[PDB]
Every structure is written in C-alpha cells, then in structure tokens.
C-alpha cells in the first residue's frame, strides 16, 4: 500500500488510542475539582470524541489545568488526524489526474 493510505490508517489507530488514554486521564485529573462533570469513564470517552471532532455541543468540558492539557492533546490529535485524511485524499486525486492527463 501507498504511504498516504498507511498514514491514514495509522492516524486512525493513533486517534483511538488518544481518545481512550485521554478519557481515562481526564477523569483522573478532574475528580477532586468541585463542580467537575468530566468524572466518569463512559461520558469522558464521549467527551473525547466531541473534543477531537470539535463537534461543539458544549455539554462537557474540563475545569482543571491537567484536564485542559489532556483536552489540548485530543483536539490536536483529532484536528491533525482528520486533516491527514484530506491530505491522503488529495494525494489520490492528484495521482489520478496525472494518469488521466497522460503525465
């Protein structure tokens, strides 16, 4: 397989790891902060997906510094990863057009 497809897949694997690790660490960081909602695993994992996609529902968010750090890693992971998929798709389209052009 071509690099850009491997990378896509790799990123997917990397993203899912980040989501899991992140939701587990988020709960760890948040319990002990009064008023915190990011304190059970199930909804923390859902919070990971919201965060990495930037879906923006605003129903859960971290209030501690370390929870916020965790969140930044998940945003960047998500944004980069999905951006990588666009790159991978552009590489395919570009290769195809060279062919269709006789180049």
């Amino acid at each position: 397989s071509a690099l850009h497809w491997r990378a896509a897949g790799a990123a997917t694997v990397l993203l899912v790891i980040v989501l899991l690790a992140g939701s587990y660490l988020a709960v760890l960081a948040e319990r002990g902060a009064p008023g915190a909602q990011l304190i059970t695993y199930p909804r923390a994992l859902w919070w990971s997906v919201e965060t990495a996609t930037t879906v923006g529902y605003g129903d859960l968010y971290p209030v501690t510094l370390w929870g916020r750090c965790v969140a930044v890693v998940v945003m960047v992971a998500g944004i980069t990863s999905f951006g990588l998929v666009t790159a991978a798709l552009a590489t395919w389209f570009v290769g195809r057009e060279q062919e269709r052009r006789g180049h």
Partner: antibody, heavy 118, light 106 residues
Framework: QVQLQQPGAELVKPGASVKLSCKAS????????IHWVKQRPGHGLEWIGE????????NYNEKIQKKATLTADKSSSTAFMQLSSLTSEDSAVYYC???????????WGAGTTVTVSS | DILLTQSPAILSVSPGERVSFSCRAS??????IHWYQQRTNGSPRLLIK???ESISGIPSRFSGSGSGTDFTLSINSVESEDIANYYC?????????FGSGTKLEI
C-alpha cells in the same frame, strides 16, 4: 462470594489514630475506585474520600475536617484509611465501597465500627 | 456540593400499597442519580442506578423515574422486607453526594 472485607471493629483512644483496612476480591480493574463512607449511629451516609489504587491518587471530602489519609497496596488489593487524632465526634461505622468509575457503589463492605473512648 | 433533598424523612404506607420516595437535586443532573437500601444493621444495597436502570438481584417491584432535578423511587406492592432507610446519591459532579435518607414504615 464477599468482595470487600473490613474488620468488624476498632477501639481507639482520644488523640490516637487507627488504620482501617478494606480487602478486595472479584473482578479488579485498574479503572476501579474505592470509596469510604461514614455513618454515625442515627445519622445517614457521608462521603469521606476516594482512591484509585492502581495509581494511588486520592481525593477527599473538602466540606469536612480532614481526619483521613487514603492509601492502597496494589498487590494485596487492600485499601487503607488512616483516621488520626480522633475524638468522640469520629465514633461511627466506616464503610468502604467499590465504584467502576461510573458513579455508583455496586458493592459495599460490611463496615467497621470505630469506637473512641478510654 | 450538589445537595439532594429527600422529603419527607419518614413515609408510612399500608401493606401491598405502592409507595414513592422523592429525591430533589439542588441543580440539574440528568439521570445521574442512584438509589440504595439500608436495613437495620445492614450496609447499603444498590437498588436502582442512573434513575431507572434495574440491578440483578432486585425485585421487579422496585423502579425509578425522573431526570434533571426531580427523582422518584417506587415500590409496587410494599411488603415487610422493604422496611428500611432509602438514600439517593448523585454522580453528576464532584464530589458525589448523598440524600438525607427516607425511612419506610408499614
């Protein structure tokens, strides 16, 4: 089988300090939290604090005077609450419970009756 | 702390009747409420979780309802073994908290 094992009782002298134990069995997860709950005779339930043993991070009820220190021993899967400089105020049953990081106390220990007198 | 209010403290009903305990929360907590039974000398026993979800080993006649700030624990057809204290407990926000307790008597 029984999952949380606490000693039945502990006599303690004013000013002294006791270390209660809570011995776990059944499905362990590293995502498991152990909680400690205080019940004075007549009164209801009162959350004291929590620990995630597979990490040692403990959080405490900040609304009340801190008498407790939480620790665990990963190998014997036993959680220890260390109550110190006690007074009659601290005479109560102390339960420990287990939570799978989903917010509810599935199982509870049978409780340890800490009595504080000379 | 989220405050949970269980009022009245004592509920008195007749054998086989249906009974409802309420838990009111000081702010809105979805369905993150859990119900425990404690008989004289016993330790608490989880009856219902997340407002309405049943637990293995609990009689069918226990059920729960509510969301937000209003919650209800119901027993279809009360009977002697149900005589106990009943507590609610929230997991929406840290720390977890407990209701003051309601005692059922027949």
């Amino acid at each position: 089988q029984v999952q949380l094992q606490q000693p039945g009782a502990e006599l303690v002298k004013p000013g002294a300090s006791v270390k209660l134990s809570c011995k776990a069995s059944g499905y362990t997860f590293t995502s498991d939290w152990i909680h400690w709950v205080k019940q004075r005779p007549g009164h209801g339930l009162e959350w004291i604090g929590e620990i995630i043993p597979s990490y040692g991070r403990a959080n405490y009820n900040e609304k009340i005077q801190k008498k407790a220190t939480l620790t665990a021993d990963k190998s014997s899967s036993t959680a220890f609450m260390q109550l110190s400089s006690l007074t009659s105020e601290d005479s109560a049953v102390y339960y420990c419970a287990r939570e799978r990081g989903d917010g509810y106390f599935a199982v509870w220990g049978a409780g340890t009756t800490v009595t504080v007198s000379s | 702390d989220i405050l949970l209010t269980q009022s009245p403290a004592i509920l008195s009903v007749s054998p086989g009747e249906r009974v409802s305990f309420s838990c009111r929360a000081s702010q809105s907590i979805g369905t993150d409420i859990h119900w425990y039974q404690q008989r004289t000398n016993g330790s608490p026993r989880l009856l219902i979780k997340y407002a309405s979800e049943s637990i293995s080993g609990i009689p069918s006649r226990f059920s729960g309802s509510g969301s937000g700030t209003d919650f209800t624990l119901s027993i279809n057809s009360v009977e002697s073994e149900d005589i106990a204290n009943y507590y609610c407990q929230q997991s929406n926000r840290w720390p977890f908290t407990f209701g003051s307790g309601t005692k059922l008597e027949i």
